[PDB]
């Protein structure tokens, strides 16, 4: 696949529960964690909802 | 068995002595706990950057 990489840039204390749960649904665990996920359009929705604290690289 | 508890109590009270302090702190059992609570802060709060120019 393309295997897009995601890096968590900001914290998660005091943040909305839906974003806190999408973070886990994606796989990010702390600040600066780097993960690789498939380019399925399902992933794009999570990363779109959480796009204000996750850096992407392609 | 009626336990005659003097030796252990004297041991515990002597174990916490903390010399070098002034006034009642070093003599009686008016012993704070700040002397040990600030150590953890200090071990992190060292200021040893050595920034003489930049």
């Amino acid at each position: 696949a393309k295997t897009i990489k995601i890096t968590q840039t900001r914290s998660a204390i005091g943040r909305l529960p839906k974003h806190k749960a999408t973070l886990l649904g994606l796989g990010l665990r702390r600040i600066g964690h780097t993960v690789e996920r498939e380019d399925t359009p399902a992933i794009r929705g999570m990363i779109n909802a959480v796009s204000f604290m996750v850096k992407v690289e392609e | 068995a009626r336990v005659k508890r003097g030796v252990i109590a004297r041991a515990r009270h002597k174990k916490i002595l903390k010399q070098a302090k002034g006034y009642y702190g070093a003599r009686s059992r008016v012993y704070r706990v700040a002397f040990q609570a600030v150590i953890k802060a200090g071990q992190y709060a060292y200021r040893d950057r050595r920034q003489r120019k930049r």
Partner: protein, 142 residues
Amino acid sequence: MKTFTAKPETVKRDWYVVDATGKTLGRLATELARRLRGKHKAEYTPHVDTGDYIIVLNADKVAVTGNKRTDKVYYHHTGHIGGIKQATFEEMIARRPERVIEIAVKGMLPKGPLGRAMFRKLKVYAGNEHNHAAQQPQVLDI
């Protein structure tokens, strides 16, 4: 290994002269505080005073910009009740000129016994003549 720190008997003093005629007051105070603090040296240490001996010449010609010359007012309380007294810059110069620069640099120095030891070195003069040629103070001409 440990970091090198300065000792009191391994300090090298220097002497200098600064002429404040036509110079702005605060901008001069900043460099004066820097040099007296010794943050300009390569062996600076925070618990030891190693600034130079600065001699300010012509302290009765300090330039102040804007309307501060007539609006900048000093305050000081004697201790008694209703004993607050003030003095405008325009008259403070004519009364005790050196005190202007003295107070202006004191507040920029730190506070404590070393803070006062540091101020002990500054020497401010209203005139332009000084009997410190015995110590050969090289002029820090700017």
